[PDB]
Amino acid sequence: HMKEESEKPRGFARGLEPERIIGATDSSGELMFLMKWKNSDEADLVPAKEANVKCPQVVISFYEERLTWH
């Protein structure tokens, strides 16, 4: 956020439209998502905080598959 670019774009910064999340992790506490990109094979990790707001519908859709209500 402060200066993710500077030389190379990453995640949403890349500009690529998020098709559907296909990954999840965490840097050191905050959750993460390996967001997918339209017409782009190579994806990119995006902070859970950024995804769960810029793409609420998308992130929510992802959980559906990787749920665990049992």
Add this chain to the structure above:
Amino acid sequence: HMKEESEKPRGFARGLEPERIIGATDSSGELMFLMKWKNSDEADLVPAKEANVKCPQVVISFYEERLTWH
């Protein structure tokens, strides 16, 4: 949606502000959430479709605890 009220309000219709989801299930395919209500002990189930749009931030927050990335 067609006429949930008619005589008695349920879920978001009640008007109560959703504090934090504390439940999840499914009628017959579509996921569900036992949405909580501000200054209200008695909660109420709300369709996943309604919650994952009217309260994206809330629903997303709920998954955080009930995750399963492993």
